[PDB]
Design a protein around this ligand. Structure first.
Ligand code: T44
Ligand code: T44
Lengths: 114, 118, 115, 116
């Protein structure tokens, strides 16, 4: 599990369950190719999102459907989506955890790189 | 003003109006002495909270009544109070803005000690 | 109508010289560039766009945070910081995009004035 | 474990190791009584901080020595300490994780309440 997510709901103080996300890798011509999708469980995580094989060095984009999450909770949110874009160097069993803290009009994207 | 606040409500996307706060200074014996109280206006600010003379170097504590704010919003807050404790160094016309981002189960306390970058 | 306030959470000052670009979502799901700019020393950009240039629709503001950290001598996590949102500037509605930066974290908040 | 912490360093992108903290419970007269102290491990956590028996409902204050953490890192911190003060409601096996995100001039205190 070289790419992990942890999404928290800052209003409820619980992980954000059922958040749809997708992972894209930057291609040679500068475009994006989608390599995985998933939805967070009740713990705000997604296990086995991608494998080491799918996660070579490069630039990646994780897009979180935060709007749907808030719309479903009954809140009108600001952001259409939450985008996390970063260069990955996973060569060496390097784990990446994308922590995301959500409020209707704010989010925090932090990274923990082990 | 040597000490300003800017409180934002991350749920509504507006400044947090009518947030009560108190400013205390640490005394020589380790206790706290309250030197100002106030309540944010609709912009999430408090003008003329304290003067330069009331703000010598020392340890200060700014306590925001975020629990009452959330209770009044019909929400369920986690924190009893939001507390910002810092050693103030006002020498050299250094002014402080305490930025505070509020959500019921989270707050962010940031400080801005210069109006410009360097 | 659109304002930004970028703060540096390491230094406790605004983030100056941060490059950004403002794009507007097009019918077919694409983007059109409406403005570019660079924050001044107070971490703001004045007269970024005008009222007529900011009609209802989805906008994307890209902040070149990677360059900012690089110039500051830090190695950052994010390749860029993107803020994407539905804008409804009808009336007096002004938008402030507040951005709090650390090398391995940022917080994007919005302050939206009523009418 | 009814009370856990998770501290991250937003400058380095790692958990914040070796952060000193103290846990106190508010008394009937509005004073404080110390119930635990500890230091985060390399994952930014402290295992077995207190027991369920030591954690009845009431107001608690967790003080984190962030100033020392930043001083040790060679940085210049703003805050003299980071305090998280909250009325704890552990009934029905509810546990608390105090998440803390640290930058020299900013921190975020969030709480995660779970039925574990
Ligand atoms: N048992 C885990 C420990 C762990 C608990 C939490 I909760 C966590 O989550 C956050 C999420 C956000 I979003 C934050 O802003 C912060 I600070 C901490 C992370 I990452 C790690 C482990 O295996 O290490
Ligand atoms: N543009 C204004 C200046 C200004 C606007 C805002 I809004 C602001 O406040 C915050 C509050 C929080 I909480 C944040 O996380 C951030 I980033 C910025 C500050 I300080 C200054 C003017 O000069 O008129």
């Amino acid at each position: 599990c070289p790419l992990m997510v942890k999404i928290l709901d800052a209003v409820k103080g619980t992980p954000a369950g059922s958040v749809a996300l997708k992972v894209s890798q930057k291609t040679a011509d500068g475009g994006w190719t989608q390599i995985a999708t998933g939805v967070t469980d009740a713990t705000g995580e997604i296990h086995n999102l991608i494998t080491e094989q799918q996660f070579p060095a490069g630039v990646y984009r994780v897009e979180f459907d935060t709007k749907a999450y808030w719309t479903n909770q009954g809140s009108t949110p600001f952001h259409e989506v939450a985008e996390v874009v970063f260069d990955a160097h996973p060569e060496g069993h390097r784990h990446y955890t994308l922590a995301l803290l959500l409020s209707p009009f704010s989010y925090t994207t932090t990274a923990v790189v082990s």
